[PDB]
Symmetry: C2
Subunit: 306 residues, 2 copies
């Protein structure tokens, strides 16, 4: 019984992947019901990207200007239309494998499963988090745009992200399924760059509990800090604000390990004092920011004595 | 353009997981064509796994006392045929969802993906490597027995692990899909423990290769070491030796850069006797060993499936 950075079974999402090829551009598209979603820049060429006018461009393209194929059999496009940075294509046969779904907009800190695909087929699946700077540290290559990110709540695929491009530092930016980017990022070829990404406090703590849970509290002390004595030390360091909503959330882990969020945060200010080796924390010389409370709670189901 | 810990798409395997209740106990089974696979110890109640005669403990049990379930439909069982550490209770209809499969068996250092299930329902999927001490450091709460580990090689899911027991140390153990346990483990309460482990090395090595491809390089240089002096120090840091039968596979690896094998090896010497204190490799502080040369190419290359 150990911690693992897991992902939801990509099974359901795969039954929604297809290949959308336009011109000399081929990427991916999510096929839900009689609709097929793909990043709109599919209808562009390296040149168009310098100053794309998607509205006018898309106009120069009809229903069978987009060759979509579910596996080896191609689908019939019965109408095209634009929605922000996506492209809603209609089809003659709604997806018979469409599962209970829904579109959400994840926030920074939150995690999700990404099913990378190429030419409409799956390569692998991995987990990751929507960093505080609105970027993602996924693993994408050309032909990867069009891939989705999700979370499955009891037989329900909550789609939250759809890949597009890759930033200067090797990180990734994409949009929600409605078609709006997760940042100040525009899908055109202009000078852009990820803003200085910090660290997720809430998950750095979840990690901290997972640690205690599984052993080691050398980073613990009778040290008690206020809800404003930690947050000052916060902006100094990369770690973000520990709102009152994080407190509550850290509640369940709190009650379990018998430790108080305040005394936990206080244990952290002493890590921004060193926190070197000597005993480390589950190996990691640093601090894991992409393991959410829910995740730790999830894995390693412990009890709470009352 | 990043390098995450990837897992195989779990669609061709999820559609195989079913539930296999027997009395009060309940596991997850593998459903291929007509046959159904599952953990022998599914006929035991309470401290039965303390005193497992099995071959006799199954005699009294009958087909009916086997509730194979596919999420609703009951699968008429008919084949209380025990095979090694597994059962082989055939059912009436063959799994229509059955994929194209093999049952190959993995060796130390090799990797595979895991579809953790509970009550026959896929919970999460992840990737782990067959440790040398012959165990799989991973995550499995109760009711994880019956879970499965596989690999995908172009239109062919080859199964290679069936989760069974969990060691006291936290790590777990199971068997190939033939019943043959892995390492010298058994399934009772003989209070067995796992031996000392060494690093697959060939993975920690091949991990660097993908580090390079993603730019992140600051070790490619070093006192270009030998072929013996190196693995010598390995046993100075707990790393099993290496043979040319292990580098000749790294053919394409180097063939996709120009970076030597030996020189690369020297980066390690300087990586442990000195370390890296400060800068990191693709994020992690520790050196990752759960990444085979194929896993690294499989990712960096984009190899899809079907």
């Amino acid at each position: 019984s150990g911690f693992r950075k897991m992902a939801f079974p990509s099974g359901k999402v795969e039954g929604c992947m297809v290949q959308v090829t336009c011109g000399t551009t081929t990427l991916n598209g999510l096929w839900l019901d009689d609709t097929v979603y793909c990043p709109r820049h599919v209808i562009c060429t390296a040149e168009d990207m310098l100053n794309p006018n998607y509205e006018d461009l898309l106009i120069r393209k009809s229903n069978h200007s987009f060759l979509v194929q579910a596996g080896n059999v191609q689908l019939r496009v019965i109408g095209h239309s634009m929605q922000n940075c996506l492209l809603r294509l209609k089809v003659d046969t709604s997806n018979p494998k469409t599962p209970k779904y829904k579109f959400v907009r994840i926030q920074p800190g939150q995690t999700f499963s990404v099913l990378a695909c190429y030419n409409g087929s799956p390569s692998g699946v991995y987990q990751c988090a929507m960093r505080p700077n609105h970027t993602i540290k996924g693993s994408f290559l050309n032909g990867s745009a069009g891939s989705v990110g999700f979370n499955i709540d009891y037989d329900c695929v909550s789609f939250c992200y759809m890949h597009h491009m890759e930033l200067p530092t090797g990180v990734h930016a994409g949009t929600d399924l409605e078609g709006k980017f997760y940042g100040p990022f525009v899908d055109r070829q202009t000078a852009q760059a990820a803003g200085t990404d910090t660290t997720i406090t809430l998950n750095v703590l979840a990690w901290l509990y997972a640690a205690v849970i599984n052993g080691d509290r050398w980073f613990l002390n009778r040290f008690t800090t206020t809800l404003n004595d930690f947050n000052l030390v916060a902006m100094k360091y990369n770690y973000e604000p520990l709102t009152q909503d994080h407190v509550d959330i850290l509640g369940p882990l709190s009650a379990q390990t018998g430790i108080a969020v305040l005394d936990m945060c206080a244990a952290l200010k002493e890590l921004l004092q060193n926190g070197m080796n000597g005993r480390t924390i589950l190996g990691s010389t640093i601090l894991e920011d992409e393991f959410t409370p829910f995740d730790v709670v999830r894995q390693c189901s412990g009890v709470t004595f009352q």
